[PDB]
Amino acid sequence: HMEVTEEDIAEIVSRWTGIPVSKLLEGELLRLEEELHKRVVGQDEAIRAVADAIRRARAGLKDPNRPIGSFLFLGPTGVGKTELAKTLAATLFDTEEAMIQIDMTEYMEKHAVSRLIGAPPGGGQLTEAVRRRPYSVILFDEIEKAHPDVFNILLQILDDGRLTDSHGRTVDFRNTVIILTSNLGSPLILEGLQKGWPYERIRDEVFKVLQQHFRPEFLNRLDEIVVFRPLTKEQIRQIVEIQLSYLRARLAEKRISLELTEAAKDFLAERGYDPVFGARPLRRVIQRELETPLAQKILAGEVKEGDRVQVDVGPAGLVFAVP
Ligand SMILES: Nc1ncnc2c1ncn2[C@@H]1O[C@H](COP(=O)(O)OP(=O)(O)O)[C@@H](O)[C@H]1O
């Protein structure tokens, strides 16, 4: 039968059950890694860790009263931690709206617990958000910064797979994936390299600070601890391409194509990445170096509907040509 599709039947069941379409259609699962790599370049370990946890939960091998999976993502800023959480929410649960992000730098000071589970009588951000979306990826950023009382509420989710809010009713977390992140150790490494410490001292200092914040009792609850890597030059080039996709899409609406020389792509990659911020500068580099002078060319009619535009490097920056 060809007229009524899988998605039609999943959609009706989803609307009636609250179970996301992609969850109901999970099996119709082996490809999860390939799907995640559509958006996340490199960080293969992270992707496999996440996919393995999900496979174990689906195969009935894990505790049904704990979340689907829980991870700590260590390593530097701007190399894919958030992109993977987003991509995982969109993939498992059909939208990025299914990613709940919590910045622990906003939960350092004691009363912040109320902000999470609700003020004491006389609701909470998290508990309300998870009540209404039980199928969600929950991203806690900079977990070491959490006030201890906030830290303990996370431990309850890991241990119990649920929370009781201030109203005294349970909120279910058994269908969540928990991703914790921390930058710890990364500025210390750069500081060591700047001050010319020996590898020995750099390593010892990183281990000290990790031991200080993350104890076995905590770490043992997680499916995996993953250390994200810095990105290679090639990986940044592939990210540049991903970040040009929407621009190409808009250009193609006027049948304009963009043909970047290798030097051009490397020009954007070099400017759009650094050790401190990872690939976070890349978006505005593209905007300033490519989209703005291209806009000018189009508005002057030097670039026209149908044109194929070679983008190269000139002295002042990127240069544009049409054959
Ligand atoms: N591994 C990666 N794969 C694809 N895109 C990436 C990757 N790492 C970084 N990016 C891109 O650069 C940005 C990195 O910043 P962000 O997601 O804010 O990093 P963080 O995980 O530190 O929050 C993303 O918005 C994304 O477009």
Author numbering: 518 to 545, 549 to 642, 649 to 849
Describing publication, verbatim:
The molecular chaperone ClpB, the bacterial homologue of Hsp104, is a disaggregation machine that provides thermotolerance by resolubilizing and reactivating aggregated proteins in concert with the DnaK (Hsp70) chaperone system. ClpB belongs to the family of AAA+ proteins (ATPases associated with various cellular activities) that comprises a wide range of molecular machines which utilize the energy from ATP hydrolysis to remodel their respective substrates. The AAA+ disaggregation machines Hsp104 and ClpB possess two NBDs per monomer, thus forming double-ring structures with 12 potential ATPase sites in the active hexameric complex. We determined high-resolution X-ray structures in different nucleotide states for one of the motor subunits, namely NBD2, of ClpB and combined the structural analysis with nucleotide-binding kinetics studies.
In addition to the AMPPCP-bound structure of ClpB NBD2 R621Q in the presence of MgCl2 and GdmCl, we also obtained the structure of this mutant variant in the ADP-bound state to a resolution of 2.1 Å. The mutant variant NBD2 R621Q is nucleotide-binding competent, but shows an approximately 30-fold reduced ATPase activity. Since the R621Q mutation selectively impairs ADP binding, we conclude that in the ADP state Arg621 contributes significantly to the nucleotide-binding energy, presumably by mimicking the nucleotide-associated Mg2+. In the ATP state, the Arg806 side chain must adopt an alternative conformation because otherwise it would clash with the γ-­phosphate. Indeed, Arg806 is located about 4 Å away from the nucleotide in the AMPPCP-bound structure. This is in agreement with our nucleotide-binding data, which show that the sensor 2 mutation R806A causes significantly impaired ADP binding but almost no change in ATP binding.
